A paper describes a structure:
Two families of human KDMs catalyse the removal of methyl groups from methylated lysines on histone tails in a sequence- and methylation-state-dependent manner; the flavin-dependent lysine-specific demethylases (KDM1/LSD)6 and the JmjC-domain containing KDMs (JmjC-KDMs), which are Fe(II) and 2-oxoglutarate (2OG)-dependent oxygenases (KDM2–7)78. Although the catalytic domains (JmjC-domain) and active sites are highly conserved, all KDM4s remove the repressive H3K9me3 mark, but only KDM4A-C are additionally capable of demethylating the activating H3K36me3 mark. In conclusion, we have used in vitro selection from a ribosomally synthesized library of cyclic peptides to identify natural product-like inhibitors of KDM4A-C, which act via a previously unidentified binding mode and which have unprecedented selectivity and potency.
Inhibition of activity is regained upon substitution with positively charged residues (lysine (peptide 8)/N-ɛ-trimethyllysine (peptide 9), IC50=24 and 12 nM, respectively, for KDM4A). The relevance of the crystallographically observed orientation of Arg6 in solution was explored using the trimethyl-lysine CP2 variant (peptide 9). Despite the lack of similarity between CP2 and the histone substrates, N-ɛ-trimethyl-lysine-CP2 (R6Kme3) was efficiently demethylated by KDM4A to Kme2/Kme1/Kme0. A co-crystal structure of CP2(R6Kme3) in complex with N-oxalylglycine (NOG, an inactive form of 2OG) and KDM4A supports the productive binding conformation of the CP2(R6Kme3); the acceptance of CP2(R6Kme3) as a KDM4A substrate unequivocally demonstrates that the CP2 series does not compete with 2OG. Notably, KDM4A was also able to demethylate methylated Arg6 (CP2(R6me2a), peptide 10) to the non-methylated, inhibitory CP2 sequence. The different sequences and binding modes between the well-established histone substrates (H3K9me3/K36me3) and CP2 suggests that KDM4s might be more promiscuous in their substrate selectivity and binding mode than presently perceived.
Numbering used by the authors:
A (entry chain D): 8 to 354
B (entry chain C): 5 to 161, 170 to 354
C (entry chain A): 7 to 354
D (entry chain B): 10 to 354
E (entry chain E), F (entry chain G): 1 to 13
G (entry chain F), H (entry chain H): 3 to 10
The structure:
Amino acid sequence: LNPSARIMTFYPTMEEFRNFSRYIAYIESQGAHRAGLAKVVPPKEWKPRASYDDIDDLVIPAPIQQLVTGQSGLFTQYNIQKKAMTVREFRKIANSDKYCTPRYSEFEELERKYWKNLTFNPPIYGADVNGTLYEKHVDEWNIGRLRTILDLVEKESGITIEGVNTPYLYFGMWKTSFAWHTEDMDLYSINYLHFGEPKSWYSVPPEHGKRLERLAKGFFPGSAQSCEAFLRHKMTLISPLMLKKYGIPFDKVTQEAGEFMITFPYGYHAGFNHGFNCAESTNFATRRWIEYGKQAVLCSCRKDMVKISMDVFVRKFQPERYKLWKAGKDNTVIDHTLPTPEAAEFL
Amino acid sequence: SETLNPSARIMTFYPTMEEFRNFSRYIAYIESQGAHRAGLAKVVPPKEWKPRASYDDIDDLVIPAPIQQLVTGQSGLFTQYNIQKKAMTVREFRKIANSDKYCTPRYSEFEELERKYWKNLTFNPPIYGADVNGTLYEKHVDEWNIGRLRTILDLVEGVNTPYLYFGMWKTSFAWHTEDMDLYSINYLHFGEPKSWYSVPPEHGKRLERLAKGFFPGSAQSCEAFLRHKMTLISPLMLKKYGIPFDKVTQEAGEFMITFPYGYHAGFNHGFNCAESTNFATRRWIEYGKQAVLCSCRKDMVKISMDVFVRKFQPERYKLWKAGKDNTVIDHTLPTPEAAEFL
Amino acid sequence: TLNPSARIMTFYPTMEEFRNFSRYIAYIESQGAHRAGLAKVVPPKEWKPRASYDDIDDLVIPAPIQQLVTGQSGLFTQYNIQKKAMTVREFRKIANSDKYCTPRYSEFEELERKYWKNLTFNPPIYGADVNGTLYEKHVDEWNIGRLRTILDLVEKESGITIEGVNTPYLYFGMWKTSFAWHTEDMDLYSINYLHFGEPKSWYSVPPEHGKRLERLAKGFFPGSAQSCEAFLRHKMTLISPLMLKKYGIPFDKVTQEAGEFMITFPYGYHAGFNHGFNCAESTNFATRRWIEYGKQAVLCSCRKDMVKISMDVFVRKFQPERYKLWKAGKDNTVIDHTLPTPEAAEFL
Amino acid sequence: PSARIMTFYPTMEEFRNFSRYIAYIESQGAHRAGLAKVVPPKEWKPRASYDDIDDLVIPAPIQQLVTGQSGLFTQYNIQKKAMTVREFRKIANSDKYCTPRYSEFEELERKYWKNLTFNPPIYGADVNGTLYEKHVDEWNIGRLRTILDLVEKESGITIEGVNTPYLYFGMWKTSFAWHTEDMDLYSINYLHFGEPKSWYSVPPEHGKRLERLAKGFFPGSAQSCEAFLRHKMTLISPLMLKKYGIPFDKVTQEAGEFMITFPYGYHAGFNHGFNCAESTNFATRRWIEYGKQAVLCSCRKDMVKISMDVFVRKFQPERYKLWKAGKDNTVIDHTLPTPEAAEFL
Amino acid sequence: XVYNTKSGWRWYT
Amino acid sequence: XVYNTKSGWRWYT
Amino acid sequence: YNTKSGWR
Amino acid sequence: YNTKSGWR
Ligand SMILES: O=C(O)CNC(=O)C(=O)O
Ligand SMILES: O=C(O)CNC(=O)C(=O)O
Ligand SMILES: O=C(O)CNC(=O)C(=O)O
Ligand SMILES: O=C(O)CNC(=O)C(=O)O
Ligand SMILES: [Cl-]
Ligand SMILES: [Cl-]
Ligand SMILES: [Cl-]
Ligand SMILES: [Cl-]
Ligand SMILES: [Cl-]
Ligand code: NI
Ligand code: NI
Ligand code: NI
Ligand code: NI
Ligand SMILES: [Zn+2]
Ligand SMILES: [Zn+2]
Ligand SMILES: [Zn+2]
Ligand SMILES: [Zn+2]
């Protein structure tokens, strides 16, 4: 509902494209971060892989069938594990008459069908598959080696976590989706669409994110009492109509093949896949994320929930505040509009 | 045998204690009255009999693998997925099942409660304490002890063992016959009622046809996908396509007998506990030979019929081994043992 | 004056003499064969009851019996323990294995000694009392299925059949399986035909000395005789031939080869064992001479379901003269075990 | 020590707590022989009289036919007509079945192994029932209150003879074959009245040897079933154990005396004359491992199996997942006593 | 129990 | 994965 | 019948 | 299972 929280898309030059962290700083100087979601179109000359011809034999070890229950625009999604399969088998199912994309004339019709048939004919989503489709030598925006301060966790403490500091492959089909969530530890996210049908995203500006979770708490009270950050479980789906009804601002955007998508700290997002496709994703950070990580509210009802130590980041970047924070008396309040400090060159 | 129970309706029996004492003889008797033609029958034991003095010492019982029943579908066609949950005691289950979130909605008549079930079974998925190895019968009970029925099924010695089912509102069981088209016995120890739907075995094929029409992918995947017990079909669909069926509500203290090749389904009204097992009679042997089994995985229930063919049909053993034993089952005919009643 | 020594006789009927079973029984009895209580008949070489025996491997034996024996010094008791049904091919597999195969020996006396020595050890299984026939339908000569004997009246009148008496029984034998001292039910006639396999050895006590055996048996099993009037009809009592020698019971022994018939005559006590894997078919039958035997037969009194044939129809149809006397418990007629069957008049 | 069978004479105060006293005798090494005798206080009586049990029914008496030679025998239990205790007593004390004349135990044992295949006697085994009076709270076989109860408390399943009491009416020459308890459980046996019951025990430490020996002497049986001794049909004479070096001990149980078998303790025996014993299985924490490792009969579906899930998770949480995964590799040292015995050491 | 066949008493359990 | 339980396929993660 | 005292 | 796509 806010003009200044609106999703921006960018068309960098090759020269601009070669330095990732700098260009992230640049889009923050343009206000992109304020929408919680930015789209980056890479130059025509850039290809992360010569061909996708050699992936049909690839294995999806733990495919999931997404059963959805709910009504009146509120839903809960249960991920049921399925037998491992290859991308060939998965492709057979994805283009089948039962699971193929429905016929439509405009995007709005496909959105209507998505929210209309969400709970019917549950699709299989090949989510969370370890791997990268980048060629190892490619230095331009290689999700496998993004080289940003997040590496402190692996370089400073040698801790390996799937998806956050390692690349993740997502093989989608029609009606597969991701619930309303922010990254673990409220980090940044990078998502590249290698090939296939589009993926559509809903975004809520971080400035209003608290409102959203407040609303969520009200509509899933029994879930909220068990865990305050129950949205971290990525099981809650909320419809655009319901956001408008309760005055939550949001934007939407459609991501096509060969395009990049960036989520910014504390930017709630959800979405769904138009058809058979493949994406590669990881998390990343800037200096501005540090405060976000210090104040991140996490799930406390799971053993394996992602909890990262912020000690080293503070010591390396906020020494003047370190001992006070480790003391626990640090009450700095975040301003979501502020671009990252690495935009000094800009601004 | 076609004269008995021509309508193929569900029959309810009221044996005396004298009649009750011999389980297999009473099964043969109810078949001599044509009960089996319905695929489902109800036995009401005499008020004097009790499997257990009280059900107030069962709180420590454990449900190792409770399942949450997520149901997806519309227009009377649904697919149920049972998700394994954390173990819990009967006491915990009783607390949850009585909670305002899962408790039995308010209704006056049964038709209203059924309506709510078919309207809301997709929402607020419930928890079912099913497939629990155990028993609530006291050790000394020798009448109709689901634990040790001692039918010819024991010649294979899973199937002849007792199981417990802790139900809450709108937990349900999908359309199915028994593994190997066996018999089943169900006793409701306590709690809210359990409603059933049944198709006369004579008309079972029609159900299968209709089911294959509604889930073609499942039918291509598997010959007997109903054996997965994930398929739910409302009575309004059955009646919409001319399929004969009947309904019965089982109360606490009542027995339900399902007969070979009798498709049944249903749902629980609220917190209750039932005990059940599979069993056989001589009449089941042919059904066991002609049963169409699940093909798509290794751990589907399969019983070797060789032992039963040797003991009860020696003269046909050779014929049966050569694949030349094509004999037609007459569903109306009662079990051989029923001769003394016919 | 015919076969005064009551020794087991063998007959070699021509195919012509083979046509009428009852007639040839009359003949062998006209020769004194019945005095031994057991006879052997060798059918003509050209005769065959069954063209081939290779299509029976899947025949089901419903109640195999594991034959457990206890005893010492030539006295033994046999308990038959039921086992689960098995096919003929499984039975033959077990019979020919090392565990149960026939031991290698030189002469018959060696196998007889080893049988009596090892009788209690390594109990064999006996495929006994199997309902069925291996006769082909078209065989009109000596068909155990349809012998056309006066005994067939029992079914015709009462309408009740007695498995193994009015109907055929099959026996699949292995080494050391044995049948205990006994006479046929109601003291009837017996017919046994060895279809294939190893031989079957028999011991036979002539009817004229049956009582002596009985006496001896009661002395050696006093408790059993207290419990029942005819405990030998339980078919559990085994008595070695050396015990019979020691106590003066006359007997003879005979070995039946494949393709051969053995006839047991009324009140002729017999026993024996099988050398190895074999198959025999058997049933009961009767002649006029049997009627008197069946009237005075002493039956098992400790069981309600023992074989009992009503004699009233036989007496009414063949003994009009004494239905009144016998039916009034006054027919004191004695039985001469020597005398042949009436039907032997045409030969005597 | 010497792994010999031990006998204990508790005070009434010691006797009151069953599990505690079991733990104590194990703290004394009683469990190494595989068999221990407990003599109860003289004052203690389980039943006021044994005159009102004459019309008790033995549903399935078995006639024990034995075949074999040279100390190796196989036993076959043939079912007979049901009879009352009175009829059984009359048969057992009759001349045909009564105990031969003997002067010392060694002679009677000699006569048993000599006449084992002759005059098969009738054994009134496996009779559901108890002879304890209703309010006897000490050493009551019906309600021993050990951790074994957990299974029934969680599922309600009961195995007759394991979780419930069995009565055995014996006569001369009736015998129980070499065996360990189902799931390698503990056993408690009490002789109510009548003539004595003789026992042979092999120490658990040497259990495997016995199995090897049995397997060698009954090769076919061992091919069919992994644990063929669990059919309880194999009899082996003491002479044959000595010849092949199996260490064993013997002991005779008298009326009013308790016998306790310990996990993986192979034992066999025979009755001297007409008598009546009551027994059942029980467990301790030490048993849990034994149950996890027990080699069970593999040829029959009707055989006794107990799920250890409840035991492992409640008493061995640390290994549960590992165990459930199948990765637990504990080696049982049969020398060690029960945990609950800590208070004595 | 016991069942009396033509071959004698047969013992079945 | 899945298990074939009595009440049908059981889904366990 | 599977019994404790053995195979009956 | 705990995986990033969410509770499994
Ligand atoms: O691809 C998906 O299903 C979900 N992706 C994301 O939430 C992301 O890339 O940040
Ligand atoms: O009780 C249930 O949930 C299912 N019952 C049956 O399918 C039955 O008893 O045959
Ligand atoms: O074949 C057997 O085992 C026994 N035969 C007979 O006793 C007979 O034929 O009369
Ligand atoms: O008493 C018997 O006959 C047998 N007893 C046992 O094997 C025992 O108590 O462990
Ligand atoms: Cl909620
Ligand atoms: Cl209750
Ligand atoms: Cl489908
Ligand atoms: Cl005697
Ligand atoms: Cl062997
Ligand atoms: Ni995300
Ligand atoms: Ni059912
Ligand atoms: Ni005979
Ligand atoms: Ni024992
Ligand atoms: Zn949580
Ligand atoms: Zn299937
Ligand atoms: Zn008798
Ligand atoms: Zn076994």
